[PDB]
Design a protein around this nucleic acid. Structure first.
Ligand code: ZN
Ligand code: ZN
Length: 106
DNA sequence: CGATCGC
DNA sequence: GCGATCGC
C-alpha cells in the first residue's frame, strides 16, 4: 500500500489567494514518512500562512452542503490514481476537494 | 487482499 | 491501528 510506505515531495503547486477553498467544492478542485504525515504538514503550514484545526494539522470542516454524512472535511484527491501510475506526493496532482465534489468525479 | 479518502 | 462513502 503506497499511501503508507514513505516518499518525498515533488511539484511546486499553484498560486492562489485568501478565497482558495471555494474552488475545492467546484469541478476538478483547488490546487495547493507517509501521506499520513504529509497531509498534516500541508495543513500545519496553512495555519502559519496568513484556525484551531489547521494549527494542530487537521483538515478544516467544509460547508454543510459540501459534506456527505460522516465525511465533513477537505479531501486531497489524486487526479491520476496511484494504482494506475499516479505519484502519491505530486503536489501538482493533488486536488483539494470536498466530500460531494470528490464523490461525483469517482 | 475494495478504493480512497480522513484521524 | 482505526473511521467514513460508494459500489451499474
Ligand atoms: Zn480521489
Ligand atoms: Zn471493505
Amino acid at each position: 500500500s503506497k499511501r503508507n510506505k514513505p516518499g518525498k515531495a515533488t511539484g511546486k503547486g499553484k498560486p492562489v489567494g485568501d478565497k482558495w477553498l471555494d474552488d475545492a467544492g467546484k469541478d476538478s478542485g483547488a490546487p495547493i514518512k507517509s501521506f499520513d504525515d504529509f497531509r498534516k504538514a500541508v495543513w500545519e503550514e496553512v495555519s502559519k500562512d496568513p484556525k484551531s484545526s489547521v494549527s494542530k494539522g487537521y483538515s478544516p470542516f467544509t460547508p454543510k452542503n459540501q459534506q456527505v454524512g460522516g465525511r465533513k472535511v477537505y479531501e486531497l484527491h489524486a487526479d491520476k490514481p496511484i494504482s494506475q501510475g499516479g505519484e502519491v506526493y505530486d503536489m501538482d496532482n493533488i486536488r483539494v476537494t470536498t466530500p460531494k465534489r470528490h464523490i461525483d468525479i469517482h
